[PDB]
Amino acid sequence: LYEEDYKLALEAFKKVFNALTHYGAKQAFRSRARDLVEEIYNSGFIPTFFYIISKAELNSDSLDSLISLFSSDNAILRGSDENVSYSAYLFIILYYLIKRGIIEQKFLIQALRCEKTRLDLIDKLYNLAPIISAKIRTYLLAIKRLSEALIEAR
Amino acid sequence: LYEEDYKLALEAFKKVFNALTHYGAKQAFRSRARDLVEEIYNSGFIPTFFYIISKAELNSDSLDSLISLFSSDNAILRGSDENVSYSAYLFIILYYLIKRGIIEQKFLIQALRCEKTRLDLIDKLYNLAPIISAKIRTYLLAIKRLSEALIEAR
Amino acid sequence: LYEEDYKLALEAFKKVFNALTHYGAKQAFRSRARDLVEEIYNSGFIPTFFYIISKAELNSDSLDSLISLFSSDNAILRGSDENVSYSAYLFIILYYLIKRGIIEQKFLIQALRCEKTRLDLIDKLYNLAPIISAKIRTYLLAIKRLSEALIEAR
């Protein structure tokens, strides 16, 4: 009928394809995409989310880049290859969580701004893990397909 | 009514037949022709198309081969069997969409060149997923017959 | 109410984060969380447990702060970074042992002081080692992830 998850994946890959300026960051985000959907299927969402935020290094420098990618289109993720790969994938997940109204965008953005409320963000995510893991499947699979299509390998 | 599509399919198959050189790529194309038509009508057009492009590896050189194949006749899309056949079937679908005016030809030949517009192409296709499920069935089934007939089984 | 290892890890990390005022202490705690898990596997949980306790160098005053950390949420671990980090990790392990009900809070708090207890604590640990080592490591892996995520790299 709708396949709105594919539309959302498309309009999110639109963004993250225009923030990873350096090409290696694109190739590494593709690596993250081809793997984290399998990991989230097997080992649930909360463990994979912890593994993503850990490898992302969400220092306040990056967090500003994400909060800007939310609204702006001239945002650019800054960092190393893998750091921005995991930051882009975290943004993918958070975009889905916002657009589908699972989280309030005001609350999320206010959390990423502060160094403490990020813990409350992770907590509220923990309380919603089953619904999130049931919903985000098609979105993440679409993102995986887009990544392996529109990006050359290494 | 779709009774001209038995000729359109003949033309598209003649093209993609004289286009693949290695016979293994022809047998792989036969495999794809059998496999994908079920998925298009079981899983939807958008999911199957994402799968197709993900397995097609849209790199500018093979893209140029396809662009010429639209217009030339000796065009040789090359590479690897399991990877050139998916591009051949994507060409099948695109040849249909062009020749039935469902998508504008110049827009396609242009978005198959500029990476940015290549994403807007997929967006357009998302906005035409219901229309391209009703029209193209007869065409794809004709391609299925032609594949099973003219390409000797592996 | 029973809380999963990730929920428990988040709940503990929250208050241990709100108790390391200085930032060098935070980075040292991260450095601990990232290797004490491999150490616990390699050298057992009881050897590593008492290594953490000793290296914490409690001095019966920081021990008071650690004990207060359970009751209040305004308590603050005090000492040097290379000691405050170990006191924080010691509290992490104690929070697990207490919350999972493996060892009573009164027993633990009565240990770490009053040297007569420490040895029967050793014996009790040798009784409960199969109970603890089953999942202490997957509780501490979440701590490792949370620390790598929400604490900068020194």
Next chain:
Amino acid sequence: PYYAFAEPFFIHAITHLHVGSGSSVEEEIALPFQRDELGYPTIYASSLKGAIKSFLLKEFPDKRDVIYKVLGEDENPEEASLGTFLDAILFAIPSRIIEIDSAKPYVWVYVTTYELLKKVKLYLDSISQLSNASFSNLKNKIDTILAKEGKNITLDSDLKSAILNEDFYVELEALNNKIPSIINAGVPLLVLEDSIGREVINRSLIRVRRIRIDRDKKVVETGGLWSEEYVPMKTIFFSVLLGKESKESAIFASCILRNLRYVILGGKETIGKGIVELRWVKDVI
């Protein structure tokens, strides 16, 4: 009545078992396991019948016509097969356990839900109303359980608390020691609420990544990477074998269904998957 004989049986997985479901595009597991109308794994009666009928057909080369009469010919067919299988309902699945409120140790138990027992009760009702072969024993062993719906419950021991598959916490309330245990197996058997049983059972499957290595350089081939999905050994499925008149059918249920104990279901039978033990409820309760 309609059915001359009715042979309900269990399917215990000796090794791991993989009954292929059929791939797709939005699948995220290249080779999935046959699910049922509510997610839980089952064995479609077609796979059951084909596997068994192919087993009997070579383990009994003398009477290769009693089989063809009860389970249908493979050449030109001129009559409907007299035998009728049924979709193997998942009965109970093993699961790792880290238990509370008991020093009595178990490293794994059996887990089933209420919806599975309701489907089994459906099978039993229909078969007892369609073959005259009643199963008051098993039917009451299941009615006694279903009288306790909406509340986790343990049968073969007393636990009162447990953590199943390292994630899920349950507060079991032993039904009664007065219930004779369904298939013994030593270990306890939990009957869980279904909303939690769903996650537990899903977590109790076995997903496994496999690769394909090039045959001349010891390195993976491109595209040679997938995942498979087994149910663990000691899994119990419950199916029913149904039969009609024409005393070839009567032979079948006296010469064939007694020498039938071990079969190979599903695929990957070169990876040692699928070895199955059938245990007829006729002689197991």
Next chain:
Amino acid sequence: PYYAFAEPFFIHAITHLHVGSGSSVEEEIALPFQRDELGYPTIYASSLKGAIKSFLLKEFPDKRDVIYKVLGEDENPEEASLGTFLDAILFAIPSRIIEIDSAKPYVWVYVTTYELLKKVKLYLDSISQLSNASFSNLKNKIDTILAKEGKNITLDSDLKSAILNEDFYVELEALNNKIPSIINAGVPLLVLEDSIGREVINRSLIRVRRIRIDRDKKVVETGGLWSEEYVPMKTIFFSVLLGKESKESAIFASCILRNLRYVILGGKETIGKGIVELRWVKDVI
């Protein structure tokens, strides 16, 4: 007999083994060893079959046709594999022991749990039903032990109590001081109850940390540090090789399995971590 031959064999690690299960997210090490449904080390039968098949394809080059027939064609298979590998059950694994009051101080000792022996007996029962082969010696040696379950057991020693892997204090009791050694080495064999053997075995592996040096400044590269699980040398995995009658299978069991002695399993062969030997119980016991 559904199986022309059954060839249960043990797998003794010569060097350490790494048969990895790929990187995951819910576990801390970066290259764990293949676990099982219960949580013990194992060797998925796919790994066994792939390794053994590649090996003896490059070893016996004249008999490619027999090998393909019994194990499977590598391209365009017109027929299934006549040969079946079962998953390698972990039989006995070394462990670091510290104990006073022994006539001999041991440095390490084998360790087993009753669940592993139950799985071994299950393999033997299944293949003895599905074949003419019967292994009464192994079954006797095994249920001789299994009778004395519910407590920790030392087969051949005088160890009263010990500390295994410097974390688990166990009080033992001898079995008979008469029962033969299945592990033909005077090293004792502890057989522990589960839920204390599960950790003792999970904790008995070898997590070695490796790095990658930044060739330009000769320090560790950033993000170039990982751990890997190996299984100790002399670990024993029990497994069964099965075959169906073909007259190529007979030849497979007539010289190839009589000349299969050492193979290279798993990965990291270039670190010298693959070598392993097969025993063929039929000529061991």
Next chain:
Amino acid sequence: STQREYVFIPITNSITIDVKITIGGSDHITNIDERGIHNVLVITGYAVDEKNGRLVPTLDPCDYVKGILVAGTPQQAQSNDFLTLKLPANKLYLIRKKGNISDDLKIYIPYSSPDARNSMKTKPVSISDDTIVNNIIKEVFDKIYNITQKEKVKIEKVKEDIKELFSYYALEQ
């Protein structure tokens, strides 16, 4: 005390004569060292007011206006409509930090009245269109950091970052 000045940096060139100080001290918190701007400040919950562009206090956590700090005091004809405030150098949500601040500082904010007669519907806008990005280097970033073209011949770096680093939310009213 050491007093810095905040400035709105929108696409609106309403910043010509709004300060008194180019350098004042030997340092502005904002630095530009061959690598792009550093210690960029962010102010959240505020928006720009392009018609006499100033920081307006709305109550939306999404409205953020990034800007730069310069050691200064505004134009000695204000404090009627400028938010003056002093912070212990930590509540500064800074971006791309280079060093550390001295744990005390006073700053001013260009304030505009809430004007509760019109809905302050604000919209996001990024700084593009180098036409306005080229001059704004001279318009403020040179008149203040006159080391520009005296140390950086690679202005395009300090040109491409502001193209992407600085942003705000816009009333468009």
Next chain:
Amino acid sequence: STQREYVFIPITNSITIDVKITIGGSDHITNIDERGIHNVLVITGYAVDEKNGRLVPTLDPCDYVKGILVAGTPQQAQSNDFLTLKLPANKLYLIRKKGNISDDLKIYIPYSSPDARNSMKTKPVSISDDTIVNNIIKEVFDKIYNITQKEKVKIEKVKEDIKELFSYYALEQ
């Protein structure tokens, strides 16, 4: 149009007399439906000044205050020093959203002077000392929320709910 006034919820009696209209109309933003408080607004970037507790403006996105939104205009002797502003009913940071909003709204907020004479060091204080919960329910949830003591005997519900849902930061300087 409509008027709604913001009321901070600290543990101090700087709120007793700041409200002039209890209801006036027949609805509000904040609600209480048999399960506690819903549709609560949160204001960030501000903190409390309990000696005449008003939302002192600072720039740390972390200094926030929590309060409910009821209708009214305060005392007609203020709004010369209170934040009056109109928002499109969505740019508010609402806690426990229940229904759609009126797509237009006027807001009144107790605003304090920046007072750039001393280092603002705000301190996070949660609501403890349930005696405080009692005297705050007497402060507002009886003088305004007359629906309490009319429908809810669940005073423990709203007490435990105020003990957690309402925390804030304050300078105490």
Next chain:
Amino acid sequence: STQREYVFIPITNSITIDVKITIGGSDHITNIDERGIHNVLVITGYAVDEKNGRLVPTLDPCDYVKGILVAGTPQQAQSNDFLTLKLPANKLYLIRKKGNISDDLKIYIPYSSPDARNSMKTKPVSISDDTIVNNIIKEVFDKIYNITQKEKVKIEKVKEDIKELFSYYALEQ
């Protein structure tokens, strides 16, 4: 710096005299390595005029002319009708890219007037008739790429591809 000239390859021999330079420097991006021409050039919206074949500028995004790009200058007799350009090697639609580019390049283009005197219907022309491929080898693939008939005994690997690697649009008008 560097100068390159793109030479059309239609089915006509109007190319024989359209450049004076055979090598000029040492490297043309158009390379041949045992497998056919690598780094072939394609431009959009353009179709050629085989009768004295020059690139007519159309606007049809389907209008593409396939040729090879060689270093040189045209005949030292033009730029009164031939387009020159300076493109930094990231704006060139090179196909069969095997080696990389020198991060900048000046390009010349054999151009012709629009000739606004008829409907500019272009014709899809695909290089067929390997007999014409033959002379095309000795005309340009041997004058310029002298390495022919010295190294490649597999000229058919350069004869089979030009029948397919090169198709274009001609006006035939």
Next chain:
Amino acid sequence: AIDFLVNILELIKEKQCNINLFSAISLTSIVYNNFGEFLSNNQSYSTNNPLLKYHIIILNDKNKTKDVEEKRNIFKREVAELISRNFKLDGEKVRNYFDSLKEVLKSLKYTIVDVEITTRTRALIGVSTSLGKLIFGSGISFDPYMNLPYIPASEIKGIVRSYIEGKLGEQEAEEIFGNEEREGNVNFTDAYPTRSKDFLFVPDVITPHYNGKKSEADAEPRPVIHLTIAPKVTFRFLIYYKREDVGKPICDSMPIILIRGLGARSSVGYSLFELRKIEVIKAA
């Protein structure tokens, strides 16, 4: 169970080659870290245990905590000496194991390169590993089933590869050791000590004064007792392959790399080895 901890030191002093050294050290670490408690307790005073010594010794008469804190450092030093003194190298396990492994590999048609290297100056290998880390803060690469310190095969392969790389280009390095797209061609095994003159482990110390200090004002010593691998120990490891064109570099590289370092902190001349013997057994 606690008697095991109380008697572990006696155990080391008596068995000396047949205790699991890994578990022995990990168990005596509990003693070391609860020293004051294990000290202030009636241990069932055993005239043969090393911890009775600290009851009759008196340091800092007045204060007790500092007395215990200095007794603990003396005890750490004594533990290091104890491990160094009693735990020596039996050696025959390694010879039999390597002979068996060589026979195995010969059966598999492997060209073998038997190599024995002697340690010149006391070596540190796997300092970041875990053995004594709980006591000394720095470990040794120890195989707690062979019960002998070992050089990881990965480490030797890596040093050899770095040398061959800097010698013959990354291209040739990968043609020998394989890149991420084809397997290697040379196989190494861990190095185990066959024979040692007198000791196996010997203690040592490092004392950073000005490591990471701003000035002379915060500087201070900070000694770190830690075990090293005594000189004259002779490790042994194999190298095998089939592509017979890869032996030539391995012959050349081996005697040159060992004169440089082979372990940690080699810049200050610690992990220096001599190539005692290279033996080759062609695949024939």
